[PDB]
Structure formats: C-alpha cells, structure tokens
Write a protein that binds this ligand. Sequence first.
Ligand SMILES: [Cu+2]
Ligand SMILES: [Cu+2]
Ligand SMILES: [Cu+2]
Ligand SMILES: [Cu+2]
Ligand SMILES: [Cu+2]
Ligand SMILES: [Cu+2]
Ligand SMILES: [Cu+2]
Ligand SMILES: [Cu+2]
Ligand SMILES: [Cu+2]
Ligand SMILES: [Cu+2]
Ligand SMILES: [Cu+2]
Ligand SMILES: [Cu+2]
Ligand SMILES: [Mg+2]
Ligand SMILES: [Mg+2]
Lengths: 277, 277, 278
Amino acid sequence: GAAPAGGEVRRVTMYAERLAGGQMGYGLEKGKASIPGPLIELNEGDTLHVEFENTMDVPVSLHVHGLDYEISSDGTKQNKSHVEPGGTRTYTWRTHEPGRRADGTWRAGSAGYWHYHDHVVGTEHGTGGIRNGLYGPVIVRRKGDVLPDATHTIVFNDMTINNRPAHTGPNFEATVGDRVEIVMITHGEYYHTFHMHGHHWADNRTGMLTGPDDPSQVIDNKICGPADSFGFQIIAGEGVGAGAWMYHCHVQSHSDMGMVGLFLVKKPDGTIPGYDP
Amino acid sequence: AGAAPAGGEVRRVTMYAERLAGGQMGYGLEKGKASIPGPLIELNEGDTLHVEFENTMDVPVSLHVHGLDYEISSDGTKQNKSHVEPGGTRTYTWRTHEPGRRADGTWRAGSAGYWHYHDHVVGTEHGTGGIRNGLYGPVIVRRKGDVLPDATHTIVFNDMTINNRPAHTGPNFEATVGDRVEIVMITHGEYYHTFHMHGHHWADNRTGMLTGPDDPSQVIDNKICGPADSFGFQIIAGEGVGAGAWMYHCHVQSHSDMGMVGLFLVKKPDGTIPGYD
Amino acid sequence: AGAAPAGGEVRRVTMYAERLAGGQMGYGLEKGKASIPGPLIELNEGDTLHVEFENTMDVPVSLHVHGLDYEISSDGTKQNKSHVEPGGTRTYTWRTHEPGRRADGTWRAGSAGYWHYHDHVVGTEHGTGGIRNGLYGPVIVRRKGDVLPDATHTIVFNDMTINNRPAHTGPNFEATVGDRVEIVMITHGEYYHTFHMHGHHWADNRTGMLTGPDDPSQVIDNKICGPADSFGFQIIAGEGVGAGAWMYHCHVQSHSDMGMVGLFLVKKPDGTIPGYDP
Ligand SMILES: [Cu+2]
Ligand SMILES: [Cu+2]
Ligand SMILES: [Cu+2]
Ligand SMILES: [Cu+2]
Ligand SMILES: [Cu+2]
Ligand SMILES: [Cu+2]
Ligand SMILES: [Cu+2]
Ligand SMILES: [Cu+2]
Ligand SMILES: [Cu+2]
Ligand SMILES: [Cu+2]
Ligand SMILES: [Cu+2]
Ligand SMILES: [Cu+2]
Ligand SMILES: [Mg+2]
Ligand SMILES: [Mg+2]
C-alpha cells in the first residue's frame, strides 16, 4: 500500500511511567510503557494532539524533532512546557506538505524519520530521561510513500540498543521478500556506525533511490551521533537469501561489547540456514 | 529575497591577525577590529580575492582556506613556506570557478558552498594552537541565482565552545518571524558534535533548501559534524512554528549540559518574544 | 578517459591470508604477495566474483565484504561457520546487480559504489584483531559508463594509522597535473576521523562527481567518517590549483599533529614539484 494525503486531526493519550531498574518509558496506555516508546505515524498535514500525563514523581516533558510545534509544545523547562508530577498537558504537533513559497523557493514537507524524547529529567536537556529510556520514533509519510510490511526501531542509546543489556539483541524476524522498515535513532554521548550484513540502502529521505536520476550514495554503514535519526526500507534477503543477518555498531569495541542484533530472515518454509544460537 | 549575480570580479581586502583579550587570536579586516569568528568573506563563483594579509602578532601565523582554488603559494602552511612571519605581510590569493562541462565530457562542479578559513601554523604545524585561540572564519561562495538571505549568522563548534564563548554564554541570534536567515556551521578541534535547532529544519544538501519536488535530500534538524566540517542552510524564521526563544545546541548530552547552547530569538513583527525575558 | 563497460562476467581469483612482518596480517592475490591494504578488487555491476580463499595462518580468518550480494554461507563469520580454519580453504562468492525497477514500483539501486572487505574473526567475533593487523582492502563496483581513472589510491584510516603505517610516514601518492586520480577512503577501528585534502574537492555522492547541473549534492573537501565507512571520488590533479605537494590529513587536530598526514605529490609535466624538496 501507499500513504494517503494527510490533513486529519488525530488525538492520542500518552503517559510517562517508571519502569523497572530506574528506567522510564512512554506508553499510550497506562501500564504499557515501552523502551523505545510507541511508534507514532502521521501523514503530512495531520495534526496530533498528545493528551499527555506524567505518572512519575519527577517532572517530565515531551520534545519532538522535525515536526511543526509552537513554543508552548517545545517541551522544555526554559519555556515552561514541561509536566509536573501527576500533571497533564496537551502537546500539539503539526505537519505540512511540500510546496512552493511566495518567494518562489520550494518549502520542504515534514516527511521523514523523526523522534521524540524527554527534555527535563535529570538535566534541562533531558540527559537523565534519555538515559532512562524516554525516547520513541515518529514517522511522517508523504503522499505516495510505500508502506512496509513491518517497522522496527533500533535506538543506539549510549552503548546499548534500546536500553537492553549487552549481547541481548534485539532480534527482528522477517520472511525473504518482506518490505521491512528500519527506524534508526541515536542518543546519549557517543558516535556510532550502524551496519547491516547482507543489506543496503540509499542515503536519502526514504532510504530508496527515487529512480535512475537519484545520485545518493548507496551504503550499508552510516555514522550517527546523538539525536540523529534516519530510516529506510529494505527487501529482506534481496539478492542474498535467508539467514541470521547480523546488524551491529561497527565501532569495534562497541560490537565487541554487545551492540549487536540479528535480522532473522526466514525462507518461506520458516527456516533460517545455519542459525545455531 | 534577492538573487546572487554572476561572478568574475577581482576583489581585494586587507586582513590582519591580531591578539585579542584572554590569550585569544582573531582575524579582522581592519586593524583593531579582529573578531572570533573572523569576518564573513562572501564571493560569487568566478570572483578572485586578493587578501593583503598582515600578521601583527609576535608569533608566525598563516591563512589556509577550504574549498576555493588557490595555488601552492597560498596554501598557508610552513610546509610550503606560505606562512607569515611576525610583523610580516603576504598576499594570499583565492580564486573560484563556475560549474561547467569538461572536455572529457564530465561535469566540473563549481566552487559554490559553505567554506571556511583558519590558521595552520600557530602552536603546531597544523594550526592547533591558532584554531584553539580563535583564528577561524566563514567563507560563502554563491552560485548565480542563489537566494540571498536577510541575515547570516556563523556558529562554530570549536572544541567544547561555541565561537570561543564561555560555557552557557550563547551566542544568541535575533530574527523576526518570516526572516530568511542563513546559518553557516563550522566545526573545529578535537571532538565530534551534533548541531540541532529547535523548531526549524533544513535540507541536507549544498544550499540547505530542496531544489524542488525532485530533490531526494533528507530533511533534518540534527547533523553530526567533525573538525573542519562546514555546511550551511537558510531557514524562514518561525515558519510553521511562530515566535519564541528557540534553542539551538549540540545534542551530545554532556555538551549541552556543559554549555554548548544558544538561543535563536524569533520575534513577532512588533518585536516581542512570547514567553521570553 | 575510458568508461566502464557493462558487467555480467564470472571472475575467479585466489586470495591468501598471510602473516606479514611486524606482527601484521594481510590479504594477497598470489602466495607470498600479501599487502596492507589488501589488493584492489574492481568489478562491473553484474559481475560475479568467486574468491578461492586460502588461510596460511595459525588462527581462523575470514573474508567479509560490504555492499555486495552474498549468501549467508559467504558472510565470513564464525556464527554461521563461514570462517576458514588454519590451513583451510573456502570459496567465497560475491555477486553484484545492476539498477532496475521492482514489481512493487520502487527502484532497486545497483551494487555500484566504493566498498571494502575485511576480516571478521581474528581476535574477536567482529574481526577486531584481524582489522587492526591489516586484514582489510578496497572493492570498487563500477556502473556502466562510469569514468575510468588514470590511477587509484586507497587511503585507510585504521585506528590512529594510515594503512597501518608508522606515524608521519605517509603514504604519499604521485600524479601529474591533469591526471584523473581516484581515491578510495575507508575507515576502521575505534575512532571517528575527518578526511581533508588540500587544494582539491569532490561531490558528496556515489562517484564524487556531480552528474550534471541538477545534482544538489554538497561539494566538500572534508568529511567525517567512522569505522567501516567507505566512500570514494575522482579529482583532476591540480585542477585550478596547479602542481605542488598537496597535503591530505585527518583534520581532528591531535590526529594530524600525531602524523595522520600524507602528500598528494602533483608534478608538472617536466616532473618537478614547486616548493617541495624530496
Ligand atoms: Cu533541545
Ligand atoms: Cu557504537
Ligand atoms: Cu558487514
Ligand atoms: Cu532532541
Ligand atoms: Cu592541512
Ligand atoms: Cu558537542
Ligand atoms: Cu530538539
Ligand atoms: Cu583546514
Ligand atoms: Cu559484522
Ligand atoms: Cu583522525
Ligand atoms: Cu585545507
Ligand atoms: Cu565490516
Ligand atoms: Mg545527498
Ligand atoms: Mg552524511
């Protein structure tokens, strides 16, 4: 399928909740917070009212990249758009289509791979909140964008993937030929290089070349730093077949210390040749 | 606003290297008016710039530029004996060119872009001391038809400082909603950074603006950069987000916590900033 | 200058992993001829390459490639048993494809680009020791019509070294004004770097050259890179700047200070270089 035109006013409830071991997460339903937080998907033109509630005992905020928001949804203590413990606030995110300005220039649309995160826990830049897990992905689609069979979010948060213990993935499953979308976000203190065995994408907005006139580099390794986000769609096993296809940071001490996961690509019969964990 | 005209003029300017307060060093176009960053040099593709350089300091200095056309005698390195002894003078010559089709059929790219100049001999034979002290400045080379901004602001991430300013001391930049604001972003020293602007976004290409609906460049509000990287872009102040004190900062978490933050102060037409002191 | 032809040929090469002087390890295409960086492999989109691999060492080694098409049995990892035991042999197969349209209407990029191969097994399950020792090399996949260079030079930022060399020992590369020179730039190890070339510049895209007036890619002379990044470009030696000893270096200041520097020696037609004494 493909993304339609946007322009709908959407509403969602979001909660900030404490998780085990001093972690913190966002969720759309009480008791269902996750790290990373829930995936938010919009079409260019949609407005999103996030009916936010802070269930925790310390102030929290919601700050987003890329989308249109007024200063009252900045989500910063500096602009008093944070949320006291037990408090509620409606954060409003807007998005727009590309189009030609009055001055004749081309205004870019909001479409892209974006993210939201806390901006007040621990420090007035959310350093503690981000460490604890207060981050999630946002995808804004342009009319006509191809929709994937599945979407997986990989966050390099310092020297962890999605705040998980070292050497515990996460792993993602697909069948050869699935259209798999990856959302890749970085957070914290470190630079990383994201690498996928057996797969490759275009270094552009969608991760696929628009066609024979697109000059973007085709890569399988990409340097990223704190708050970078990008994404792409790949065809699982395309040209390479089934297997346990590693993805990892390629900084050698990072992969050695467990910033590694598996893209488990199954044959139609469900099997993965050579996988023996 | 307006549009850059075709280039090809032979320009001259005087430049001085001078000590500034606090052990710093800076370039200036007039004696006693050195600044950090140094003066913005603007050229149209095809222009030549003769820089009549004077070192007013007691140690050797040099002038090295990125991206422009210069002969080995304008390298600005002791390795090529193109540095300037204390109290000495030298004319550095920079040339630029338009794009065009080569005889071998390939396309020769033009000089247009966001570039920079800096010292290459103070402290070490790579200018490590000079760059630390403040000897760096921006160069913009425009292509005919490029959109001209209402103002240009230079943001240099020099090690753990912005423009050699003390931690948490800006700089701040003011604009009015709707202003076409041009940002030149340069990085120097030892560390990688990620430049982020609240409430604004740009295209990751030469100009920071999409050329049109066919341009696949990623639209971003966060960009990793390392020593001697330079990029620039233009934004419409407050476009889709309104007035406010819009933070910009390095997004490496400890760097924003330890002072690499500033404010893009976007005023209403009446000159006020809602929710700002 | 010449142009790459269409691909589609089945190629075969023998590759040896061998210990080198100074506690290093390298790949070579002929026995006793290993080098750091490893030999340059050049393919046209559509070519298949069968690498008949020989491990002459006393530890397991592997061959892992970026960007190219390979089945899991040619992954080159211990995890799926595609490493090569000491004294062993294995045939790794690399395939490449041309650009085209998918049935779902989307464009499938071709394999063309600046890629690289390296060990994935020595020292750790990610080849940390093998890469550090010198088990890396470049792979160029050309698209039909790509312009061919007069020379190709590979520059690998491996931890704090260039091509595993001692600090302040280059390498240097020579050219004549007007030569079309190709640079393959690969990064490995632990650290980020920024690659800078005095006097020259390129486009931040697949080929390093703008396709024409509609290509909006940034033109640069400085680029941040991290472990396993690869890019490449072509420059006309001395174009608009003339002959000379043109430094290239990492621009992280302590890195250039510590010797991550080399010389692009661009000669005049008489063979001399202005302002440079050998
Ligand atoms: Cu912020
Ligand atoms: Cu990493
Ligand atoms: Cu790999
Ligand atoms: Cu952020
Ligand atoms: Cu230099
Ligand atoms: Cu920083
Ligand atoms: Cu932000
Ligand atoms: Cu420089
Ligand atoms: Cu790997
Ligand atoms: Cu370096
Ligand atoms: Cu330079
Ligand atoms: Cu690799
Ligand atoms: Mg691009
Ligand atoms: Mg990039």
